[PDB]
Design a binder for these strands. Sequence first.
DNA 1: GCTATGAGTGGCCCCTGTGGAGAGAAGC
DNA 2: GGGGCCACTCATAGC
RNA 3: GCUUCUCUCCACAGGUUUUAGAGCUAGAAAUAGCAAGUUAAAAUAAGGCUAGUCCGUUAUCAACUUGAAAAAGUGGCACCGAGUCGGUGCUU
Length: 1025
Amino acid sequence: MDKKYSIGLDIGTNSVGWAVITDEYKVPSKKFKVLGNTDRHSIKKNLIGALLFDSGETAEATRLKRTARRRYTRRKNRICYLQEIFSNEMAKVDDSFFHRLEESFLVEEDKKHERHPIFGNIVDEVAYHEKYPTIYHLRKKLVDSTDKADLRLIYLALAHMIKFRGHFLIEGDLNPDNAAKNLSDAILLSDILRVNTEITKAPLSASMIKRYDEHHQDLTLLKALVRQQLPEKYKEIFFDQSKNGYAGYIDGGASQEEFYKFIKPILEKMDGTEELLVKLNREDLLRKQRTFDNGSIPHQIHLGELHAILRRQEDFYPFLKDNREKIEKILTFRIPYYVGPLARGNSRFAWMTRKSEETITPWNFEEVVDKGASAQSFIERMTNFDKNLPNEKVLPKHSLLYEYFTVYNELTKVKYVTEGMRKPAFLSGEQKKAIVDLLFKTNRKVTVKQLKEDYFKKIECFDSVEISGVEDRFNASLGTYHDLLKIIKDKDFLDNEENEDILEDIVLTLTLFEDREMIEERLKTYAHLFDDKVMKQLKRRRYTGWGRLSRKLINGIRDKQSGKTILDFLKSDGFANRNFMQLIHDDSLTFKEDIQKAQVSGQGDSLHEHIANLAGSPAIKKGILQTVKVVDELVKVMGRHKPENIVIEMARENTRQITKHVAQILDSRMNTKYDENDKLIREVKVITLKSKLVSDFRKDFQFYKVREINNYHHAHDAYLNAVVGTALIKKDKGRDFATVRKVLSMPQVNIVKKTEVQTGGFSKESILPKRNSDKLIARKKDWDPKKYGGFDSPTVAYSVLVVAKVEKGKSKKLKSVKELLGITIMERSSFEKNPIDFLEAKGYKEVKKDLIIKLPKYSLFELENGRKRMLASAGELQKGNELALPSKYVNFLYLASHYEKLKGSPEDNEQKQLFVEQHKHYLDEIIEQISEFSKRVILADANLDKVLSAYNKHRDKPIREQAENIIHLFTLTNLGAPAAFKYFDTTIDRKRYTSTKEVLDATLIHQSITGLYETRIDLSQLGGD
DNA sequence: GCTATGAGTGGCCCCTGTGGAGAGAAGC
DNA sequence: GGGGCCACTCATAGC
RNA sequence: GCUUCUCUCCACAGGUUUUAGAGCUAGAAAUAGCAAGUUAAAAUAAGGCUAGUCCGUUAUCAACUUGAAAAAGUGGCACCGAGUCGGUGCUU
C-alpha cells in the first residue's frame, strides 16, 4: 500500500525548511542505513529538517573589480605607448632610464642599475628636488619657460598628466579663462583655480604652488607660536606619529578631518590664531597637494597644459611636433561606452565586431571598429526576446509595420449594422484598405463618428451605421505614418512596399540611438534618396519603446498552403477574418506549427536556466535551487512516489510573481504525464499561502516560536505551513492539536550546515608592513615578503588530511604525524593538479595518497557525549550542537518577553499574566538547563561562572528584564561561530576554540543535503601512530 | 635541568567617495 | 561578523 | 511621473606598500637639542594561454561506482515507544 503523504516547504534568504506529513499530520519515522567503517549500521530519524547556508552574493563587487582591472591595464598601456614614442630619443640620451623607472620598487640590493631613478646620481637628484619641491613646480616651469628643457623631466611631466588625466564630465572644449554655462565654468574653475591672478595658461599649477607656499608659511607660524607658548607639546605634535598631530597627519595615516579635529582646541588656547582659525573654517590650514577635492578637475585643463608644453618644447625636439597629434589623442581618447571591451571573441562580456585583423591602437580606432554595428549590438544583446519566437528580436514600438498590425487587428473584429441588415458583418479586405487609406493615413486619431461621417456616409453611401467593438475612438493609429508624411512629404514613397525595409530600418535607427552623430552616420546611407532638409528633420525625431511581436512572426513566416503572412491575413481574410489570436491558434495554418517549432525544449530548466533567469536577488535564486534539490532528494527517499500536494511559503526578504514561477517549476518537475487528450495529468497540487494565516494560527493556539533559541523554528514553520494548507484544502481538534503538540517538542530535528568551498579574494586587500614572519604573502613571485611586505590572512578553500612523516627538530628526525593541512584558494589549482608533488614541496615525506580525504568548510566531526564541532577552517572550530528547549519553557519565555506588549483581549491577557505569575520558578530551570548544556558541550567554564554569578546578583529584577536578558543569553549556545553578548550590565567575551588536534581521533560525518543518508568515517583507525 | 611547543586569554584588525549611458519587469 | 595575527604566560612533552 | 532587480560598459579621485628625496650637532652608546616634513616611481588579487589593449573574487560542489565533464546509478518494510533517538517481527 502506497502511503499517501504531502510535503511542505519554507524559502528564506539563508535557510530552507523541509517537512513530510501525512493526512494525520504526523511526522513518520524511518530508519536509514549508515555507510562507512563504523559499528553504527542504522539510525532512526524523523522526516523533518532545515538547511542552513551562506547568503548568496551579487556580482556587483566582481563587476567593480573587473572595471578597475581594465582601467589599470589601459593606464599601463598608455604609459607603454608614451614610452614607445619616447624610447628612440631616450636611447640617445640615457639607455637605462626606463630600466631604473621600472625596478625602482625593489631594494638597493635587487636593483640592477644605479639607485637614483631620475638621474642616476645623488647630486642631480638633490638639484632636482631643491629646484622643484613638487611636480606642479615642474609643470609650471615647463609651461612658462622657453629654454630647452631636459628630456627626462618632460617625460616625467607628460606621464604625470597622462596617468592623472582627469574626468570627462563635460563634452566639448572648455574655456579656462572663464551665460549659465559660462557661470558654471566660473563656479567650477574658481573652486579649483582659486584666485589665479597671474597671467598664465596653466592656472592649476599656480594654484597648487600657492597652496604649498601657504602650507609652508602656516606651518612655520604654528611651530613658532607653539614653541614660544607651549614647549611641552612640541614633541607630541611634531614627533609622535601615533597621534593625530602633524606627525600623524603626514607620516601616519591620519587624514585632514582628524588633524583639524585635533588641532582646533590647541588653536583656541594660543594667541594670534584668528587667521589660523579662519583658515580652519575654510578647510585651508596646511592642506596637502594630492587631495580628494581634485576629482572635480576637468580633463580639458590637463589637455590645455599638455598642448602648451608640446607647443613650447616642440622646436627643440622635432619628433614631438610629428607626434603632437598622437600625444594629444592619447589623452583625449577613451573607448566609447557603447563599444565595450576590445576582445577577440574569447570573452563572454564583449560584443565588438571587427573589420580588419590589425592590432587595435588609439590612433586607428575609427578605421578598424564599426561604431554603428557596435552600438547596434550593444543595444541588441540582452534585449527582450520575442516570446513566440525565442531566438528573434521584437520590433520597436513605433514601427510602421507594428502600427499596421494594430490597425488591422482592431478593424478585424469591427462589425457594422445598416438598414436592411439582420446580423452585423465583418469588414472585408477592400473595405479595410479603403478605411485605412481614407482615415488612418489622413487623421492622427480615428473615431467612430469620424468613420461614420467619412467612410460609410460619404464613400459607401450608408446614412445609418452602428459600430460595435470600438469605444468612441480607435486606439490604434498611424502616428508614425503621419510624422513621415510631415517630414518626407512623399505619399507614394511611403505607400510603396519596396520602401518597407528602408522605412523600418530608419525607424529602428531613430529608436535605437540618442547620439545624433550615430543617427546621421547610419542614415547617411539613405541620404541619396532624401534632400538635406528632409534629412535634418528626421534626425530631430526620436522614438522609444519596444513592441511585443517580432518582424519574422508577423510578416516573416508564411502559411505553407496560402503563402500569406499574418499581416496578409489581417489585410484580407474573407469570411473568416481571423485576428492574431485566431491566426496563431488555428490548426489549419502552419503558424501554430512554426510557433511550436520555435519553442525549445532543452536541458532540464530551473537547474541553471531559471535559476539565472528569474527576477530577484541571487540569494532567493540559490534558495529556490536548494529547495528543488531537497524536493528531489525527498522524492528519492519516499520510494519515488510523488507527493499528493506541496505547500510552499516565501519569507519576505527582511501576489509575488516569483512564487508563481516556483510553483510552475515544481509543477513541471512533478506533473510530467500527459493524458489521452494531450492534457497534463496534475497528480500534484501546488499550494501558495500567506504568512499571516500561519502567524495567526500560532498566536491562536499558544504555539509560539522564538528565533533566538535555536534553528528548529524554520522546520516547525514549514510543518505548520503544510498542515494549514492541507487542512484548508480538505475543508478533529481533539486529536490534531495533540499531534501538533507532540511534534513541536520533538528533539531530533536534522539541521545540516551546507558544506561549501570558499571562493573570493586570495586574502585581505590591506597591505601590511614588513615583519619577520613567514605568514606574509608576497605581491609578486620574486618579491621576498620580509623585504617588501605584502598580503596577510589568506582564506583557506579547504583542508586535506595528511598522514606522513615530518622532519622535526634540528636533527631533522622523521616523525610519523597526523595533522590537518589547509589549502588556500590561491593554491587550489596547484594542489588539485598533483597532490603528491604539492605535499612534497610542503616537506611531507612518504605520502599516503589513498588516505587523502577532502574536508571542506563546515565539515562535521563527532566527539564524546554527543559533542559536535564544525570545521570552520584549518585551525578553528565552531559549535555543533543545538539547545533542545522544551516547548513549555519556550511558551513561557515568549509570554514573559511580550508581557507588556500583548495584543489580545483583556481576559486572555489577564489569564496569560496570571499563568506567568504562577510559573516564575521556570527561570531557575532554564538557567540550570543552560548551565548543564554548557558544561556538556560548550566548555566555557570561565564565561559560565561569570554568567551564573550575574544571574544570582540579579535574581530580583523585574520579570520582563529577566526575560529579555535570558533571551540574549542564548547567543553562547546558538549554532555557528561564538559571538559576544551583554547580559544586564556585563560584557561577556566570546569563547573561541583555536585547537583542532582533537578532531583527528574524532568521528568524521558526511551528510547529504538533507542528511538522511549518513557516511561515517573513523579517522582514528587510519594510520595509527 | 633545559627548551620547544602548544594551549590558552585578551585585544586589535579588516580599502573608500564620486560620475556618465543603455533595454525590460514588478510595484506607486 | 567572523577568522587571522600578535603578545604574554604557563603546562607539558622531548631531549 | 518615482523605487527596485538589473548588469554591462566607460570613467575619475583617493588609499596601501617599498624605494628615492644625503638629517645635523654633542656624546663610545643609550641619548639630549636642533632641523625637516606637502612630492615622486611601480604593483594593486598569484598569474594563464586562446597572446587579446583578453581573462582571474557572481552562480555551481554529502560519500561510493561509471563517466573528461555534463550526466547517470548506488541505501527494506511495519509496529510500539522518544533527551539528539531505542526495541520488536518478516524479507533479502
